[PDB]
Structures are given as C-alpha cells and as structure tokens.
Amino acid sequence: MYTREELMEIVSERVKKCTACPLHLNRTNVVVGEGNLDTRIVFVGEGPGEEEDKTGRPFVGRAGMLLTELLRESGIRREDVYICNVVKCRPPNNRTPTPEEQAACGHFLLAQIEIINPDVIVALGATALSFFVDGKKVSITKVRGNPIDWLGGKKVIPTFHPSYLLRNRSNELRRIVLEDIEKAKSFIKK
Ligand code: SF4
C-alpha cells in the first residue's frame, strides 16, 4: 500500500510547496529531516541555519558537527537515528522562529513522528521543548533532563541545544548533555 519511505516523501513534497508562514520567503532549501525511519529515538532541534539551508540537510553546520560528536560519545551513529527540527525553513538572519511560525510548521513534525513512531524523543533546546508542551514558553535550564510523558506513552527528554555548547565549552555542561542522552537511551524498548 504505502511505505514509511513513501509517506516521508509525501511530507517532503508538501514541505517544499509550503507557504503557510513567512519563512518560505527567506529559505533557499527546505530542510525536512534525515536518517533511519526505523529508529526508536528521534532528535529534534529548532530550525535550519545557513549550512542546513544551503544543503537541505539538518545539523550540518557547526552545531551539527558538535551534535555528531555528542552522539558518537553516546554510542550512536547519526545514520542509525533520525534528526529534524520544529521548523523547516531558515529564518532571516537565523533569528528564532516566532511562535506563530512554530505553530504553522508543527503539523509536519507531528507527521514525521507518527511515521517513525519512536519510543523516545530528545528535544534539543527551548523551541523543540516548547513543541512537546503545547507551545508554552519554558526554561530549558530549569527542566532539562526530566522526562515528559508525551502522546502514546512516548517519552521526551529535553536538553540543551548544541549551539549553546558551541559558546560555552565547559566539560561539566557537556557531561550534563551526555547524561540526558543516556537517560533518553534508557527509555528505548528491549
Ligand atoms: S517554516 Fe514550515 S510552515 Fe513555514 S513556510 Fe516553511 S515549511 Fe511552511
């Protein structure tokens, strides 16, 4: 009938045609998401930066290369998981997407999670976290590392966005994010 791959391609073609928010006027390429459609763990960030926009691929700039290393140090190959964002189009000057933009784009993310049907989601940063708590503004610093019970018994573990760890190179902060990723892994089923 229809495979996960075909469903994801339908999402991708709809994203490419999307003009539901002002971000479509700014982006060079939409950035849908990448990796393993049978992952039990999905990583979700905010939205594309410059290198993402140029390539159509998520987490390929500086924050993304850091993410690759966090995953490696957590025993995870990027190819084996799925990585995406709340918004699909790069905002002008890489500004934070507005709540209205996040709301317009969010149905695509919900569709990607429905297709993959993971056990656990790692929400990287405040925008991603907001998505999984009905759009509420909530401090990542205050709630990071605490699992959230989301739809269908899926667990969401919020942590810092890798951008933050670009600016603050402390070992303690890195160890905290690695502990959050390991807590995420512990919710993947047998
Ligand atoms: S950011 Fe999302 S809702 Fe906005 S135009 Fe791009 S694909 Fe559409």
XYZ file of C-alpha atoms and ligand atoms in Angstrom:
198
model
C 0.000 0.000 0.000
C 2.251 2.817 1.306
C 5.704 2.514 2.919
C 7.239 4.771 5.577
C 9.596 5.954 2.806
C 6.695 6.973 0.532
C 4.904 8.664 3.434
C 8.033 10.643 4.242
C 8.424 11.614 0.569
C 4.819 12.924 0.642
C 5.671 15.040 3.705
C 8.824 16.281 1.929
C 6.916 17.331 -1.249
C 4.302 19.133 0.837
C 7.047 20.954 2.801
C 8.725 22.039 -0.464
C 5.360 23.528 -1.646
C 4.508 25.110 1.712
C 3.857 28.850 2.052
C 1.909 28.676 5.367
C 4.260 31.105 7.154
C 6.630 33.993 6.237
C 9.768 31.766 6.452
C 9.069 30.381 2.933
C 10.130 33.784 1.537
C 13.604 33.531 3.097
C 14.860 29.951 2.631
C 16.965 28.544 -0.194
C 16.006 24.940 0.560
C 13.567 23.425 2.983
C 15.234 21.084 5.486
C 12.997 18.126 6.207
C 14.973 15.696 8.321
C 17.314 12.749 7.786
C 18.276 9.263 8.822
C 16.739 5.966 9.827
C 12.931 5.731 9.551
C 13.009 2.707 11.953
C 14.908 4.487 14.733
C 13.497 4.212 18.235
C 14.972 7.647 19.104
C 14.465 10.964 17.269
C 16.444 14.178 17.822
C 14.545 17.437 17.328
C 16.047 20.916 17.169
C 14.802 24.403 16.408
C 15.226 25.055 12.701
C 17.819 25.388 9.941
C 20.885 27.600 9.998
C 22.962 28.711 6.949
C 24.699 25.431 6.099
C 21.415 23.489 6.553
C 19.680 25.916 4.206
C 22.414 25.573 1.539
C 22.368 21.744 1.611
C 18.806 20.810 2.503
C 20.152 18.704 5.378
C 19.716 19.095 9.154
C 22.566 19.699 11.594
C 25.412 20.080 9.128
C 26.942 23.381 10.357
C 28.993 23.917 13.495
C 26.248 22.903 15.950
C 25.603 19.889 13.841
C 29.197 18.719 13.798
C 29.122 19.056 17.623
C 25.935 17.029 17.698
C 27.657 14.301 15.675
C 30.322 14.119 18.367
C 27.832 14.060 21.246
C 26.105 11.135 19.540
C 29.408 9.318 18.957
C 30.318 9.757 22.640
C 26.839 8.346 23.497
C 27.492 5.323 21.275
C 25.136 6.452 18.497
C 25.780 6.655 14.760
C 23.858 9.523 13.090
C 22.868 7.171 10.266
C 21.093 4.935 12.760
C 18.797 7.700 14.197
C 16.512 10.422 12.788
C 17.241 14.117 13.123
C 14.900 17.013 12.371
C 13.550 20.376 13.595
C 10.425 22.166 14.608
C 10.594 24.499 11.601
C 11.636 23.549 8.079
C 12.677 26.957 6.669
C 15.659 29.108 7.757
C 14.548 32.439 9.301
C 16.111 35.715 8.120
C 19.437 36.325 9.983
C 18.958 32.958 11.740
C 16.546 34.589 14.185
C 14.467 32.342 16.444
C 11.287 31.340 14.611
C 8.255 33.150 16.102
C 5.597 31.177 18.000
C 3.259 31.716 15.011
C 5.869 30.199 12.659
C 6.457 27.265 15.009
C 2.646 26.670 15.156
C 2.256 26.804 11.348
C 5.086 24.298 10.709
C 4.431 21.878 13.578
C 1.985 19.601 11.768
C 4.925 18.405 9.587
C 6.903 17.374 12.648
C 3.893 15.610 14.098
C 3.563 13.693 10.830
C 7.255 12.685 10.912
C 6.944 11.363 14.461
C 3.750 9.471 13.506
C 5.593 7.774 10.627
C 8.684 6.790 12.614
C 6.744 6.016 15.811
C 9.802 6.288 18.157
C 9.891 5.327 21.849
C 11.756 8.486 22.819
C 12.422 11.984 21.540
C 15.307 14.266 22.538
C 14.206 17.861 22.360
C 17.335 19.973 21.778
C 16.654 23.451 23.083
C 13.753 25.581 24.165
C 11.920 25.692 20.818
C 11.867 21.901 20.500
C 10.800 21.573 24.128
C 8.006 24.065 23.551
C 6.619 21.912 20.801
C 6.183 18.981 23.152
C 4.499 21.029 25.889
C 1.724 22.610 23.706
C 3.615 25.761 22.660
C 4.276 27.010 26.194
C 7.394 29.111 26.837
C 9.516 27.077 29.302
C 13.093 27.435 30.527
C 15.337 24.693 29.234
C 17.743 25.317 32.086
C 15.001 24.600 34.614
C 13.554 21.381 33.174
C 16.341 19.748 31.129
C 16.965 16.085 31.818
C 13.425 15.447 33.196
C 11.358 13.061 31.067
C 7.991 14.328 29.779
C 5.169 11.912 29.057
C 4.022 12.737 25.564
C 1.487 11.076 23.199
C 1.024 7.331 23.302
C 3.473 6.765 26.135
C 6.400 8.283 24.176
C 8.986 9.976 26.385
C 10.515 13.375 25.613
C 13.853 14.262 27.230
C 14.734 17.936 26.880
C 18.304 19.077 26.917
C 20.423 21.994 25.679
C 20.680 22.797 22.021
C 24.222 22.049 20.709
C 24.595 25.766 19.779
C 24.797 26.538 23.468
C 27.722 24.165 23.899
C 29.474 25.930 20.997
C 29.528 29.123 23.064
C 30.125 27.559 26.477
C 32.823 24.941 26.147
C 32.754 23.701 29.756
C 33.244 19.948 30.376
C 30.529 19.955 33.040
C 27.927 21.213 30.586
C 28.939 18.629 28.014
C 28.785 15.896 30.640
C 25.221 17.030 31.526
C 24.027 16.760 27.903
C 25.647 13.349 27.584
C 23.813 12.264 30.764
C 20.497 13.465 29.200
C 21.146 11.491 26.018
C 21.933 8.375 28.077
C 18.651 8.905 30.028
C 16.895 9.037 26.636
C 18.525 5.775 25.535
C 17.339 4.072 28.724
C 13.717 4.541 27.573
C 14.201 2.688 24.268
C 12.370 -0.675 24.479
C 14.037 -4.195 24.528
S 8.756 27.083 8.076
Fe 7.218 25.349 7.863
S 5.104 26.383 7.904
Fe 6.699 27.971 7.444
S 6.761 28.102 5.124
Fe 8.491 26.663 5.829
S 7.570 24.594 5.714
Fe 5.832 26.117 5.721
